[PDB]
DNA sequence: AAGCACTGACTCATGAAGT
DNA sequence: ACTTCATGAGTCAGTGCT
């Protein structure tokens, strides 16, 4: 039994490791996408409400 | 007996923390930005009620 | 250079969720 | 309690950095 169990775990570790690498790639992209969107919404709000100090209301967060 | 097993054991832990930390970091940044964006979308709605912002800047698929 | 730290991958032992 | 897949950590092999 140990032989096949060992083989199957070798497959699961490969899958787990690839799963973590893709997860990191994914959140790296989403962080950037959300950050750019944040910049777009702050600019649109400024265009529509030229008299509103957005940065003072909803302070920016680092990245 | 005797091996440089100790050094690599430490390096392995370090390499895994670096990655785990990076992942946690991006996750936090992503979550932080998302909440901020939801507050911005609400502010724009309550400031410019008759504006379809989603048709200008659709919500990012988290 | 040439040695030391970094990382990919295999194995072990446990963890977590569904039966 | 059993079965299975997922994962944190030690270890070895190969890589990369200075």
Descriptive terms for the model:
homodimer; 63 residues; mainly alpha; Single alpha-helices involved in coiled-coils or other helix-helix interfaces; 81% helix; DNA-binding; viral protein; bzlf1
Structural overview:
- 2 copies of one chain form a homodimer.
- With 63 residues, chain A is an all-alpha fold.
- The first copy, chain A, has one domain (1-63): Single alpha-helices involved in coiled-coils or other helix-helix interfaces, CATH 1.20.5.170.
- The first copy, chain A, is 81% helix and 0% strand.
- Chain A is built from 2 helices and no strands.
- The N and C termini of chain A lie far apart (50 Å).
- Chain A binds chain B through residues 20, 23-24, 27-28, 30-31, 33-35, 37-38, 40-42, 44-45, 48-49, 52, 54, 57-58, 60-61, 63, and chain B through 19, 22-23, 26-27, 29-30, 32-34, 36-37, 39-41, 43-44, 47-48, 51, 53, 56-57, 60, 62.
- Chain B binds a DNA duplex (19 and 18 nucleotides) through helix 1.
- Chain B: One of its GO terms (molecular function) is protein dimerization activity.
- Chain B: One of its GO terms (cellular component) is host cell nucleus.
- Chain B: The modification Phosphoserine is found at residue 12.
């Amino acid at each position: 039994m140990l032989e096949i169990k060992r083989y199957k775990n070798r497959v699961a570790a490969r899958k787990s490791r690839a799963k973590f690498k893709q997860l990191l790639q994914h959140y790296r992209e989403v962080a950037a996408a959300k950050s750019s969107e944040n910049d777009r919404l702050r600019l649109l709000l400024k265009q529509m409400c030229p008299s509103l100090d957005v940065d003072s209301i909803i302070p920016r967060t680092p990245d």
